[PDB]
């Protein structure tokens, strides 16, 4: 910058943005009751 | 008179730094002849 003994004339400021997201997840699994009552584990669901 | 030193004045959009001073003379000044006739004057050369 340079003040002459004059003056009369400059800066600026801004701001930027940030976007975030909400993205949805999940899985599952199936089982028989057959597979329960006739497994050679006691505790499979567990 | 009206002075306005350097600082916050003169300070204005024109001069942000405000870095001017001013001062001013105002006056009304008028008159009024109501004998003419007992104003005389006289015009000459001199060397």
Redesign the interface.
């Known amino acids: 910058p340079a ?1 002459t ?4 004339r400059r800066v600026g400021f801004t701001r930027i943005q940030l976007i975030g997201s909400i993205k949805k997840f999940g899985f599952f699994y199936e089982w028989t009751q057959e597979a329960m009552d006739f497994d050679t584990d006691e505790e499979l669901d567990s | 008179t009206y002075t306005k030193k350097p600082g916050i004045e003169t300070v204005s959009y ?7 001073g001013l001062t001013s003379i105002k006056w009304y000044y008028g008159s009024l002849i109501l004998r003419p006739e007992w104003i005389a004057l006289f015009k000459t050369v001199a060397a």
Do not use: T
């Open positions: 003040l003994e004059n003056g009369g | 024109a001069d942000p730094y405000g870095e001017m």
